[PDB]
């Protein structure tokens, strides 16, 4: 069983290293527009993650104008 696991792990190493190597030249040919595309694609997921705590807001109170605290409603 250990020999089989070693063989399959080495196969995964072969494949994943080949994947990363081939993806290296792919990334090497990226210009300004392609990096912009990467950042823009990443932005919505980050925004969704950061805004997740905002889901549980109960009520919002907004006041404006520099006046006293006697008027109330």
């Amino acid at each position: 069983i250990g020999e089989a696991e070693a063989a399959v792990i080495e196969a995964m190493g072969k494949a994943e290293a080949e994947r990363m190597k081939l993806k290296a030249e792919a990334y090497q040919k990226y210009g300004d527009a392609a990096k912009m595309a990467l950042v823009l694609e990443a932005l919505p997921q980050i925004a969704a993650k950061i805004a997740a705590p905002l889901t549980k807001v109960d009520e919002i109170v907004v006041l404006s104008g520099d006046n006293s605290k006697v008027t109330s409603e």
Binding site: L54, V57, V61, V62
Partner: peptide
């Protein structure tokens, strides 16, 4: 952080 029951915002 999103486990909070309620969040109140006041300005």
């Amino acid at each position: 952080l999103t486990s909070a029951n309620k969040i109140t915002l006041v300005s």
